[PDB]
């Protein structure tokens with residue numbers, strides 16, 4: 001089972017996924033929409049609830065809180081280990097789509113990073129982890145917008 | 158100036174960018190939208206007429222047919238060579254976005270390939286070129302849809 005990771009960060013590494021983040025870049029969220037189309041997303045509870053169950057996405061929500069769903073496209077798992085073991089029987093591909101601690105728990109295990117860097121250095125309390133040494137960038141593209149952004153794909157060797 | 162190339166093809170290499178393609182995959186066009194946002198696209202006359210001006214794109218149309226657009230985000234050039242030399246002064250990135258003849262002329266000169274392969278074998282006269290051997294795939298992802306499709310990025 002291939003594991004991807006997708007995140008939007010400021011230049012300083014503040015996580016910019018969230019709903020009412022005021023330094024969002026018009027056009028960047030198109031990348032997230034394109035890459036996650038009919039994909040399994042591994043997310044924590046806060047990420048699921050902020051995002052909602054978007055069309056054409058399937059959700060593995062990891063929480064040991066008493067979270068509940070009646071959406072057949074939303075599975076709940078007490079741990080990452082339990083999520084991964086169970087998705088191995090369901091799909092070939094899972095995209096880790098956030099939570100600070102979700103990303104910190106998993107970044108060493110994933111094969112591919114999809115990183116959007118917004119060209120701003122704002123104040124935040126939740127940072128993306130340092131990219132490990134055994135990842136290398138294999139594609140980069142710049143976008144002019146209200147705030148400029150860069151899209152970069154990394155691969156583990 | 159980096160040159161990228163973006164296309165949607167069948168599994169037998171038939172070009173499937175067009176407006177009324179029966180074998181178009183739900184979702185795949187999201188990739189084109191995301192990669193082309195506030196980019197310069199290099200296209201032929203036909204591709205530009207079919208596509209019209211989607212907003213938040215700028216267009217370099219190459220044609221020898223003295224084509225006329227009354228449109229803010231379009232520049233007309235007589236050749237590919239003439240287009241690239243003027244764009245070099247205006248932008249650091251152009252995305253070659255179609256005409257089979259456009260793709261044929263430029264594929265050997267571009268740096269990055271964006272290929273969506275739709276899982277089907279229709280008939281058609283306009284094929285995409287064979288991929289020069291100096292290109293390697295650096296990224297693959299598969300999509301289940303009404304017709305399955307694969308997105309692949311190649312680097313020179």
Ligand SMILES: COc1cc(Cc2cnc(N)nc2N)cc(OC)c1OC
Nearest residue numbers: 006007008017018019032047050051097
């Ligand atoms: C599409 O809406 C959301 C998406 C995400 C996750 C996310 C968003 N953008 C990027 N580039 N990567 C991600 N993993 C997170 C969200 O809230 C925390 C969202 O709600 C606005």
Ligand SMILES: COc1cc(Cc2cnc(N)nc2N)cc(OC)c1OC
Nearest residue numbers: 163164165174175176189204207208254
């Ligand atoms: C978004 O609309 C169009 C886009 C294109 C070009 C194009 C379309 N899809 C992909 N994957 N790559 C491309 N270069 C070509 C078109 O018609 C010829 C379009 O009109 C529907």
